[PDB]
């Protein structure tokens, strides 16, 4: 089911990870690499292009190809790669990701309440008739955080969130299987609507942080 | 100098923008599209793959290709595309981007001071012997914000920042041409070092916001 290009890409990535190709070193020449992996030169060129695009490698025409430290070259889209290939960083990464979600959402949620309260309420209202199951909630939660990011009026927040949908719902489907996770979330969306209704922009920060800690307790107990 | 693939990609993107291909509609069939643009079917397939990857289109094997609203599908890497092709959103987007930079840096800078103060100081010290010119400062500024993002211990902040280097230094080279922009920045890095030295984690938020407003005044006067 895995194409030769797919096999080649995965082999190079894992080789960087296990250090066959340590970050900061150059990749063996293409003939050698293609013979080692078992793919044509055309297949290898295409795979190197994709890996360079995702920040794993730096390529320059007519020059050796360097292995990067992806931590300083890659963007958010590698999160799904680390996940797919089961990197060791995954567990702590989701915690890091949820911490980031909590903290930057304190920013755009407050802005959304100040700038476009009606849109924010519209987004929050979607929680009203949601089905009581994991799948419905993972979907709902993603749309509420993203909808509020969009409602801030600063689209950069939405672009940040845009790629995690799959990963996002993934963590969410596991998390929202717990009815208590679903209840805390409904309480959270309801309190956000109230705060936006009351124009209590100042209370957003502590409310979101509190939901971060508590949802954190539930998540950790689970996992 | 522009390849046929490059011409094809740019033509489709601009067509979405000027609405020849409105978001939510499907793209004309491939034979028609390739004849319209003047590229082979192979070239078009490769270009559609790239556009789908960047979120402009949604493709599904054996199904019509849909034109997306990139605002809800694309990630941060499209910022350089909007820039390259001169979208109308560009001017306000950089303001949005600088607002985001200010607000999320309040988060990771404070965390960096609390978690890895030595690394944070090391990063800030790089300002000490920097050359007094636009290029040196744009480079320095990017490395200090990213270095502090890395020093927070949460690598997600670094991944967010990682792609803007080119765009980042671009805005920075224009901004730091002004000696006053360079002076305010040095004052800012020096004050951050002092705060980290004093363990005054609580003052990070207002200091960064203040630098955001003031650097904002300089930038706007310029532009
Ligand atoms: C926008 C970018 C894209 C990210 C979005 C995509 C992510 C996919 C979304 C997943 C699907 C949604 C389903 C869910 O709702 S799961 C949500 C479960 N919550 C959760 O896992 C906790 C998230 N963490 C947080 O919200 C914050 O980390 C805390 C509020 C808990 C803490 O704030 P921080 O700023 O990060 O650190 P601080 O120094 O204040 O406090 C440290 C203290 O906090 C605890 N802690 C618990 N979980 C933590 C994470 N993830 N990071 C850091 N600390 C975390 C303590 O263990 C810690 O130390 P202490 O000894 O003092 O308790
Ligand atoms: C991490 C994600 C990737 C982003 C990094 C890549 C970006 C490339 C980096 C560019 C290279 C660096 C060179 C430079 O140092 S240029 C820096 C110049 N500063 C600057 O342009 C101002 C940045 N804006 C801000 O810092 C904040 O917006 C403010 C502190 C000014 C305001 O905070 P916000 O939260 O955004 O809004 P708030 O409601 O509190 O205040 C609104 C008030 O602020 C003014 N304002 C000025 N510039 C503004 C931007 N960019 N957005 C929003 N408001 C901005 C006012 O006009 C506004 O209304 P008021 O009538 O009340 O004054």
Swiss-Prot record, chains A, B:
Pfam families: FadR_C, GntR
Chief subcellular location: cytoplasm
Example of a GO cellular component annotation carried by this entry: cytoplasm
Source species: Shigella flexneri
Domain of life: Bacteria
Signal sequence range: none
Cell compartment(s), UniProt: Cytoplasm
NCBIfam families noted in UniProt: fadR_gamma, PRK04984.1
CDD domains: WHTH_GntR
Keyword flag Repressor: yes
InterPro entries given in the database record: FA-response_TF_FadR (IPR014178), FadR_C (IPR028374), TF_FadR/GntR_C (IPR008920), Tscrpt_reg_HTH_GntR (IPR000524), WH-like_DNA-bd_sf (IPR036388), WH_DNA-bd_sf (IPR036390)
GO terms under biological process: fatty acid metabolic process; regulation of fatty acid metabolic process
Lineage, highest ranks first: Bacteria, Pseudomonadati, Pseudomonadota, Gammaproteobacteria, Enterobacterales
Domain named HTH gntR-type: residues: 2-70
Protein name listed in UniProt: Fatty acid metabolism regulator protein
PROSITE patterns: HTH_GNTR
